Amino acid sequence: LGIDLGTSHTAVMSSRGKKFLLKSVVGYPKDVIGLKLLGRPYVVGDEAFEMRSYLDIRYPLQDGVLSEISDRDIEVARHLLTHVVKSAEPGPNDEICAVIGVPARASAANKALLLKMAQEVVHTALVVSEPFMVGYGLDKLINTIIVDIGAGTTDICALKGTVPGPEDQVTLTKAGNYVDERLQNAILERHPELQMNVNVACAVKEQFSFVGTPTEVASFEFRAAGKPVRADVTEPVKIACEALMPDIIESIETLLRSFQPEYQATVLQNIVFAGGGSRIRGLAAYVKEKLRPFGDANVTCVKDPTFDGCRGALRLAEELPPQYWRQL
Amino acid sequence: LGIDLGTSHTAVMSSRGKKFLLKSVVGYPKDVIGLKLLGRPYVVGDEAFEMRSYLDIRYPLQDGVLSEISDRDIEVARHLLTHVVKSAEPGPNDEICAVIGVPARASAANKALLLKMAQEVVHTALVVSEPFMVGYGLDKLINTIIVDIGAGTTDICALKGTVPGPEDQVTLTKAGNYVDERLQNAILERHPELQMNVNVACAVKEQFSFVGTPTEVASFEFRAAGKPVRADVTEPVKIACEALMPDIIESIETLLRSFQPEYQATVLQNIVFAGGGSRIRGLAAYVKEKLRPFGDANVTCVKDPTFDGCRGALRLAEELPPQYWRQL
Amino acid sequence: LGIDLGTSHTAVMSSRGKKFLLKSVVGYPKDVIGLKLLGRPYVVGDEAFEMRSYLDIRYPLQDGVLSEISDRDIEVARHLLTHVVKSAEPGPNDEICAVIGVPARASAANKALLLKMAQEVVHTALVVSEPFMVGYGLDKLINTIIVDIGAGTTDICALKGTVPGPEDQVTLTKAGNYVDERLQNAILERHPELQMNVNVACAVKEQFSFVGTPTEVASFEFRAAGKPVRADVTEPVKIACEALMPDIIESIETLLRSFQPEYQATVLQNIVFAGGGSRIRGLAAYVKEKLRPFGDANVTCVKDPTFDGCRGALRLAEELPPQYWRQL
Amino acid sequence: LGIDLGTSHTAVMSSRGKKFLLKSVVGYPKDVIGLKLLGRPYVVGDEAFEMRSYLDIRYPLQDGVLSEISDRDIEVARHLLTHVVKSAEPGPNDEICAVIGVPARASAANKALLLKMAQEVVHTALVVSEPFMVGYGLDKLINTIIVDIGAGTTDICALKGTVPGPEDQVTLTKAGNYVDERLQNAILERHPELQMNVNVACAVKEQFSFVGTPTEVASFEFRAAGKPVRADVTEPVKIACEALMPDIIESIETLLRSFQPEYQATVLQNIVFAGGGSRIRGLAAYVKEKLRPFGDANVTCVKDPTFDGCRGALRLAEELPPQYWRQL
Ligand SMILES: Nc1ncnc2c1ncn2[C@@H]1O[C@H](COP(=O)(O)OP(=O)(O)O)[C@@H](O)[C@H]1O
Ligand SMILES: Nc1ncnc2c1ncn2[C@@H]1O[C@H](COP(=O)(O)OP(=O)(O)O)[C@@H](O)[C@H]1O
Ligand SMILES: Nc1ncnc2c1ncn2[C@@H]1O[C@H](COP(=O)(O)OP(=O)(O)O)[C@@H](O)[C@H]1O
Ligand SMILES: Nc1ncnc2c1ncn2[C@@H]1O[C@H](COP(=O)(O)OP(=O)(O)O)[C@@H](O)[C@H]1O
Ligand SMILES: [Mg+2]
Ligand SMILES: [Mg+2]
Ligand SMILES: [Mg+2]
Ligand SMILES: [Mg+2]
């Protein structure tokens, strides 16, 4: 059971052979109101996004990584597993093991969290990081730089072929949520100084992801009063979003300098952008083109990362020689 | 010039020879109270704590050095410099160079910020990290794992014999602010469900820092309604703060595993704790005593870190051979 | 002036008659820390061994042979010479001549290097093979095969009747350093796979040199992690050290076969072992006893080679007239 | 079965009559990649050159001298045999005897290893030195010193008389590996002080072998930091290999002293140079020309030594009279 548990979607590819491309966020009814009819005993996935105004949303994966459960009872993770795993549970003992995607710098408490749940439910406790699944799934060679841009963290993975873990790699905290804070600051420098929330900032990032080049687009949107309506330009959206590139290429530069000549010379392994970064236009302009410029390596974007994360799930589904399971 | 940035203090050690015990927080007037340009054009220190309800508080440190400057025009930095540096400014044109403490994993954007400030004050921009600044004030031998427990980060950096700088260093995010979040989470799961804020969690941490041992103390504090007042037993304050110790000694263990036999055999040089951590009772119990226990090396607590930060400035005040200034 | 320059010690006896049993290894401070001037411009002796983690210690005697010195200024050897001059400074024209010990197969280029330095410090250059120097100090008869087992090389030299020079003498590269590599090979091919360096392997050899017989000893030492500690057996230390002697007596067999009939009948002339090999227990068992046995010649080990290196200096102080000086 | 076994490449002539110029170095997979002992039962030659970062490489012929295989099972040399010899094995018992090239000064321990391998392949163990292949294949008269300059050994052949095999000959291991050490030290004399590994040192030697004369060439490569690619000059490359020939002709001078009057009078037979050193420009300058000069003897170089190694193997293949094999 290879699951890419992330900040937006939850890509489930079982070993049995079924594909369930489910969604993120877990809530439960904020006050005492209604029975199951109104809400549900915890709400998981798309209905919690649809009812995000009626539920208390308890972070279950802070910064794209298993936290601990802030309710301090392990019920957000329990009802998460109820929705994802129990409702689609194999009825023939398809010898099921569990691989939950973790960020590149995962803690031992996140490993312990997965361990306790694997012992409770009944799954071999395996821990594989998100960019490892990509490097095992997509048939890439060493060294293929993997930049996974989600909402919570930004994983800069460029390990040697031993894949030692968090030794020669760094998980950055500046991600989509950091950009959303800068987008909130960007619209406070406008004339009417709108104060929109994070959900609105996410909508602008999703619909108008034109960061490398000044594509002439605008967000036709309403002001806080509700009657005024105008096309908000993306002049300060470009400025806000392009300020994270320096840190990405600085971490890449620092790592490449410390590697051997054959890992320095990879002007053909490219830099692979996955996640939400694959849907942002103009990220190849900085490295490949003449804009940052950052050397001259080519840049590759993953088409449909949600569908290509199940390839890594399939790769780890077989055969996983028990000897590897004891060693991981 | 040595500036020891911090939440508790922003200490200044001049070349002339004076110690200025200055304080944190920078705001500027959000309303129309007092005068802003003729009274307090930005407010720094204890007056900003005193008037924290009428000022717009735009952090500018975030547990470390230059954060980013949320004004986004060098206005938090400029009026901070006006308060601190221009008030201590030597009048005899003393060969002043700028040494400002940075976190163990400092960025190049922090260096860029230091450079922008160095152009404002025309001084040489020098970059010295805090763990080594402590080992300059307290000249201990190799190697004493200097751990700086502050409000923002927890910097764990062992020392190498040649003292090359922080090449192998750990900066954790779990710090005093993380403890305050856990303290809030603890009292939201109790009988009376206290509704205290972050500053109150910090206040109780400061007044009753008993974590290693169950010393029977109680915090005379107001209940969730606000008028009722009683001696509230600090039972779960010990529990909440206990859970950060594992990570501190895990990073040290990871270093010891990677160290060579010469560096492994250094338990007589002990581990030194500075910052707010050195004012917590029971910190030596885990490592020095027989409670975790963690090995054998003894524990030394820094008394009055403010003074020892000025010792590090004094060490770096002379002679700093221009050749060292070009090389740093 | 006789200098027995080794990897363990540097025995100095002046012409005047004073004994200075000085120490090995030359370093200098590796990164910018402290000041060599304040400490020592290059550090010579056990201070550099004790501070080998603070200093760059570039080998200045690869297997009893001076290196080319990549700095190309010969300042490792000039400060080494200075160290000895500080200990044994000449005053009233101390008829000082330089007796320098060399390995048995030293090249003319190696002698020319020593000659250049002897001309720099104005002294008569007298190149004497180390095995012959031992036979000058400990006056044995012909033919007493002298085997000098050091860290760098193993010098096997039958004493010649008139001692004409390098007629037939052998320098092997397998020595203490080779055995230390085999000790590393032992602990890396065992169950717990201990991770220890050469310095520690040398320490175990020094403290527990029990090779011919299975003396029941154990080395109380820390494991690869560094915290665990236990008494490690010397079963595979005996195996690792066993294979030195076979190669030594292989070369001696070649000498015995090459001897003329009057040199063949020399079983009462025996074989004398010096260096670090004189402090190994069970060495005489291989030859003298009935273990290999290598014939039945008796074995004599040199007691305190450090103290008996000055006896050869005294023998090569006097005499050596204007004909001996022109001859070398 | 005449096998020239080296560290760069091998040369095998079969009884059938085919030339196999196959490559050297043996590893086996250390990281998890493909199948370990099933994808390639130990990895030899060009796949180990291409995949050198995934393999554990354990040399078994340091400087033309068989080691002891530190795995302590002698499986690195046995799988090498199954790679080369078993893959080209006669299927009709083409009377096969094993002729493995040995250094001019081989030990009895090296012969013991040949005997261990001869039991694995069931063939007669024959011991013939490497430069005898050259002197018998390319029939030169007696006595024409042969200097075959390889990576590991530079066997100095001087056909002796009577006694038993090696009477007056010496293996010189001041060879490619020595030059690699000189090159690494010579590029540290540059301004930025390049710090390159052995593979790069070999690459520069192979591409621009200009030593005797100052031919102005340069190699576009990475500097010490390794950011720019610039035409790196060969000023200190000429210096690095300047002290090689002097030491070679030092040994030849010693041979000329040991030669009989008619053996000494062989300047019309010249000195024959082979191996990788035969493709270094300026080789005859030192001896034949007026640069050292070493007298005035003429110099002959072998064209394509790699292709002439099979001619020497063929010469030993036939007829190889059994009476000679019993006597060898
Ligand atoms: N078209 C788009 N342009 C920019 N960002 C997008 C787009 N679609 C989704 N995203 C962003 O992708 C982020 C989710 O991270 P992603 O890696 O795609 O999901 P997961 O973490 O589940 O694998 C969200 O911040 C979301 O706004
Ligand atoms: N007696 C005390 N017990 C516990 N913590 C204290 C005490 N006094 C001060 N502190 C804490 O020390 C912290 C300040 O440490 P400091 O090194 O200035 O932080 P930073 O350098 O990250 O800004 C604050 O969180 C403060 O509450
Ligand atoms: N008690 C001991 N047992 C075994 N070896 C020892 C002992 N004491 C010293 N040695 C070894 O003696 C060696 C020193 O030999 P030395 O003559 O100084 O070397 P070199 O001749 O190469 O200069 C070192 O390898 C050291 O470990
Ligand atoms: N054109 C060249 N110039 C100089 N050296 C070369 C050249 N080509 C190969 N070599 C060197 O020849 C050496 C190997 O020669 P070889 O006779 O195969 O030695 P071995 O038998 O010890 O492997 C290597 O060091 C290689 O770099
Ligand atoms: Mg993800
Ligand atoms: Mg601090
Ligand atoms: Mg010696
Ligand atoms: Mg060869």
End-to-end C-alpha distance for chain B, whole angstroms: 16
How close, in Å, is residue A250 to chain B by CA atoms? Answer: 9
What CA–CA distance (Å, rounded) separates D40 from B61?
57
What CA–CA distance (Å, rounded) separates B13 from D107?
71
**Which listed ligand is nearest to A129 at the C-alpha?**
5
Alpha-helical regions (H) of chain B: 46-50, 75-88, 108-121, 130-137, 176-187, 198-207, 235-242, 245-258, 261-264, 284-287, 305-317, 322-327
If we measure between CA atoms, which residue out of C111, C148, C114 comes closest to residue C8?
A: C148
Comparing alpha-carbon positions, the chain D residue that sits nearest to C110 is D247
Both structure tokens of C73: 């200024």
End-to-end C-alpha distance for chain D, whole angstroms: 16
CB atoms within 10 A of CB D39: 11
Q: Do A42 and A76 form a contact (C-beta atoms < 8 A)?
A: yes
What CA–CA distance (Å, rounded) separates A91 from A88?
9
- The letter for the amino acid at D250 is E
Both structure tokens of D111: 């012969």
How close, in Å, is residue D81 to chain A by CA atoms? Answer: 29
Q: Give Cβ neighbours of residue D185 (< 8 Å, ≥ 6 apart).
A: C68, C70, D240
User: Computed from CA positions of residues C46, C47, C52, C53, in that sequence, does the dihedral angle turn out positive or negative?
Assistant: positive
Q: Do B148 and B4 form a contact (C-beta atoms < 8 A)?
A: no
Shortest CB distance from B264 goes to which of C32, C199, C226? C226
If we measure between CA atoms, which residue out of C13, C298, C29 comes closest to residue C145?
A: C298
What's the B211 CA to ligand 2 centre distance in angstroms?
15
What CA–CA distance (Å, rounded) separates B271 from B278?
12
Shortest CB distance from C196 goes to which of B163, B261, B327? B261
Three-state SS at C99: strand
Let me know if A1 is exposed, middle or buried by CB neighbors in 10 A (0-12, 13-18, 19+): buried
Q: Do C267 and C197 form a contact (C-beta atoms < 8 A)?
A: no
Beta strands in C179-286 (DSSP E): 218-222, 229-233, 271-275
B201 — alpha (psi -120 to 50), left (phi > 0) or beta? alpha
Going from the C-alpha of D213 to that of each of D187, D285, D301, the distances in angstroms are 19, 8, 17
Both structure tokens of B250: 């895990």
Using alpha carbons only, what angle is made at residue D257 by residues D254 and D261, rounded to the nearest 5 degrees? 145
User: Computed from CA positions of residues B276, B282, B287, B288, in that sequence, does the dihedral angle turn out positive or negative?
Assistant: positive
Using alpha carbons only, what angle is made at residue B70 by residues B65 and B75, rounded to the nearest 5 degrees? 80
Give B222's strand partners: B229
Using alpha carbons only, what angle is made at residue D65 by residues D64 and D69, rounded to the nearest 5 degrees? 125
Count of all residues that appear for chain A in the document: 328
CA of residue B283 relative to chain centroid, distance: 17
What CA–CA distance (Å, rounded) separates C156 from C103?
10
Residue numbering of the annotated binding site of C for Mg(2+):
130
Q: Give Cβ neighbours of residue D176 (< 8 Å, ≥ 6 apart).
A: D149, D150, D151, D152, D202, D205, D276
Residue C124 parent element (H or E): strand C124-129
Give D125's strand partners: D98
What CA–CA distance (Å, rounded) separates C43 from C26?
6
Count of all residues that appear for chain C in the document: 328
If we measure between CA atoms, which residue out of B124, B51, B55, B49 comes closest to residue B94?
A: B124
CB atoms within 10 A of CB B37: 7
Three-state SS at B49: helix
| Helix axes D176-186 and D198-207, enclosed angle (nearest 10) | 100
Top mutation candidate among D134, D205, D217, D278 for ligand 4, by most atoms within 8 Å of CB: D205
Q: Do A272 and A134 form a contact (C-beta atoms < 8 A)?
A: yes
Q: C-side interface with B, Cβ within 8 Å? A: 29-33, 51-54, 196-197, 199-200, 222, 224-227
Q: Do D55 and D28 form a contact (C-beta atoms < 8 A)?
A: yes
Q: Give Cβ neighbours of residue B303 (< 8 Å, ≥ 6 apart).
A: B278
Using alpha carbons only, what angle is made at residue A155 by residues B128 and B116, rounded to the nearest 5 degrees? 35
Determine which residue's CA is closest to atom 24 belonging to ligand 4: D151
If we measure between CA atoms, which residue out of C42, C9, C44, C43 comes closest to residue C23?
A: C9
Dihedral, CA atoms, C57, C60, C63, C68, nearest 10 degrees? 120
What CA–CA distance (Å, rounded) separates C151 from C177?
6
Determine which residue's CA is closest to atom 15 belonging to ligand 3: C150
Both structure tokens of D98: 């094993």
Q: What's the DSSP call for residue B278?
A: G
Give A218's strand partners: A233
Both structure tokens of D207: 């591409």
Beta strands in chain D (DSSP E): 2-4, 11-13, 19-20, 26-29, 43-44, 55-57, 98-102, 125-129, 146-149, 154-157, 170-172, 218-222, 229-233, 271-275, 299-301
Method used for this model? cryo-EM
Number of H helices, E strands in chain D: 12, 15
Going from the C-alpha of C108 to that of each of C326, D180, D248, D254, D287, the distances in angstroms are 17, 22, 12, 11, 19
State the residue for tokens 């091998």: D10
If we measure between CA atoms, which residue out of B239, B98, B250, B97 comes closest to residue B172?
A: B250
A34 — alpha (psi -120 to 50), left (phi > 0) or beta? left
Give C156's strand partners: C147, C170
Both structure tokens of A296: 């001259």
Is B212 annotated for ligand binding? no
State the residue for tokens 């290059």: C42
Q: Do C57 and C25 form a contact (C-beta atoms < 8 A)?
A: yes
Deposited resolution, Å? 6.5
End-to-end C-alpha distance for chain A, whole angstroms: 16
**Whether residue D143 has a cis bond before it, omega within 30° of 0:** yes
Going from the C-alpha of B27 to that of each of B31, B77, B114, the distances in angstroms are 12, 11, 20
D193 — alpha (psi -120 to 50), left (phi > 0) or beta? left
Is A269 annotated for ligand binding? no
Q: Give Cβ neighbours of residue C296 (< 8 Å, ≥ 6 apart).
A: C267, C288
Q: Do C73 and C63 form a contact (C-beta atoms < 8 A)?
A: no
CB atoms within 10 A of CB C126: 18
If we measure between CA atoms, which residue out of D67, D59, D64, D65 comes closest to residue D25?
A: D59
Question: Which ligand 2 atom is the nearest neighbour of the CA of B8?
Answer: 18
Both structure tokens of A225: 């009063």
CA of residue B44 relative to chain centroid, distance: 17
Q: At residue C105, what are phi and psi to the nearest 5 degrees?
A: -105, 50
Determine which residue's CA is closest to atom 7 belonging to ligand 1: A206
Alpha-helical regions (H) of chain A: 46-50, 76-81, 108-121, 130-137, 176-186, 198-207, 235-242, 245-257, 261-264, 284-287, 305-317, 322-327
Q: Is D6 in the pocket of ligand 4 (CB under 6 A)?
A: yes
What CA–CA distance (Å, rounded) separates B244 from C114?
61
**Which listed ligand is nearest to C208 at the C-alpha?**
3
Q: Do C19 and C84 form a contact (C-beta atoms < 8 A)?
A: no
Q: Give Cβ neighbours of residue A328 (< 8 Å, ≥ 6 apart).
A: A126, A127, A128
Three-state SS at B198: helix
Three-state SS at C5: strand
Strand pairing category for B154-157 and B145-149: antiparallel
Number of H helices, E strands in chain A: 12, 15
What CA–CA distance (Å, rounded) separates A105 from A153?
10
Q: What's the DSSP call for residue D133?
A: H
Q: What's the DSSP call for residue C195?
A: -
CA of residue D66 relative to chain centroid, distance: 13
- The letter for the amino acid at C210 is F
Q: Do D102 and D129 form a contact (C-beta atoms < 8 A)?
A: yes
CB atoms within 10 A of CB A319: 7
Strand pairing category for D55-57 and D26-29: antiparallel
If we measure between CA atoms, which residue out of D239, D248, D309 comes closest to residue D274?
A: D309
What CA–CA distance (Å, rounded) separates A98 from A85?
10
- Rg of chain D, C-alpha, whole Å: 21
Residue C312 parent element (H or E): helix C305-315
Dihedral, CA atoms, A276, A281, A283, A285, nearest 10 degrees? 170
Q: Do A266 and A297 form a contact (C-beta atoms < 8 A)?
A: yes
What CA–CA distance (Å, rounded) separates C160 from C145?
9
Determine which residue's CA is closest to atom 1 belonging to ligand 2: B206
Q: Give Cβ neighbours of residue C218 (< 8 Å, ≥ 6 apart).
A: C231, C232, C233, C234
- Rg of chain C, C-alpha, whole Å: 21
Three-state SS at D170: strand
State the residue for tokens 């950009």: A179
Q: Do C41 and C26 form a contact (C-beta atoms < 8 A)?
A: no
CB atoms within 10 A of CB D236: 17
Determine which residue's CA is closest to atom 9 belonging to ligand 1: A276
How close, in Å, is residue B310 to chain A by CA atoms? Answer: 32
Q: Is B176 in the pocket of ligand 2 (CB under 6 A)?
A: yes
Q: Which residue of D37, D53, D195, D229 to mutate against A (max A Cβ within 10 Å)?
A: D53
User: Computed from CA positions of residues C96, C101, C107, C109, in that sequence, does the dihedral angle turn out positive or negative?
Assistant: negative
Burial letters A25-49, b for 16+ CB under 10 A, else e = bbbbbeeeeeeeeebbebbbbebbb
What CA–CA distance (Å, rounded) separates D98 from D101?
10
Determine whether the interchain pair B256/C29 forms a contact, defined as Cβ–Cβ distance below 8 Å: no
Q: Is B308 in the pocket of ligand 2 (CB under 6 A)?
A: no
Going from the C-alpha of D283 to that of each of B50, C37, D170, D242, D305, the distances in angstroms are 86, 47, 21, 11, 15
Q: Do B18 and B286 form a contact (C-beta atoms < 8 A)?
A: no
Using alpha carbons only, what angle is made at residue A199 by residues A198 and A201, rounded to the nearest 5 degrees? 60
Both structure tokens of B110: 């922090």
Determine whether the interchain pair C247/D109 forms a contact, defined as Cβ–Cβ distance below 8 Å: yes
State the residue for tokens 């003729």: B38
Q: What's the DSSP call for residue B277?
A: G
If we measure between CA atoms, which residue out of B26, B21, B19, B27 comes closest to residue B9?
A: B21
